[PDB]
Amino acid sequence: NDLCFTNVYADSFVIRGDEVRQIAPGQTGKIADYNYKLPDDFTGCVIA
Amino acid sequence: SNFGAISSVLNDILSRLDPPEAEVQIDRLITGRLQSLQTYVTQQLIRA
């Protein structure tokens, strides 16, 4: 809560519990595999 | 010389590692090579 970001996205899903980290830069796995992906930048959070 | 990375071949770094980190090894090689070029050109100037 210091700068103003201009645009944010409401992105969400659910996981296999096991990989509560698949959502991470380049960090691999079935979600980063044929389910989803994260940019190497991803100025964001995996708040979950 | 691998300047402290795993190896000194670019085709070898990509084939055993994931691009999240790969950049670090690559950057290492980059820095080393770059310094080498600097040294060569500087001594060339002095000799010239």
UniProtKB/Swiss-Prot annotation, chain A:
Outcome reported for the amino acid change (mutating residue 30 to T): In strain: Gamma/P.1
Domain of life: Viruses
Region of interest (Integrin-binding motif), ranges: 16-18
Quaternary structure and partners: Binds to host ACE2. RBD also interacts with the N-linked glycan on 'Asn-90' of ACE2. Cleavage of S generates a polybasic C-terminal sequence on S1 that binds to host Neuropilin-1 (NRP1) and Neuropilin-2 (NRP2) receptors. Interacts with host integrin alpha-5/beta-1 (ITGA5:ITGB1) and with ACE2 in complex with integrin alpha-5/beta-1 (ITGA5:ITGB1). May interact via cytoplasmic c-terminus with M protein. May interact (via N-terminus) with host bilirubin and biliverdin, thereby preventing antibody binding to the SARS-CoV-2 spike NTD via an allosteric mechanism.
Function, as annotated: Attaches the virion to the cell membrane by interacting with host receptor, initiating the infection. The major receptor is host ACE2. When S2/S2' has been cleaved, binding to the receptor triggers direct fusion at the cell membrane. When S2/S2' has not been cleaved, binding to the receptor results in internalization of the virus by endocytosis using host TFRC and GRM2 and leading to fusion of the virion membrane with the host endosomal membrane. Alternatively, may use NRP1/NRP2 and integrin as entry receptors.
Record protein name field: Spike protein S1
Organism of origin: Severe acute respiratory syndrome coronavirus 2 (2019-nCoV)
Whole sequence portion shown: 388 to 435 of 1273
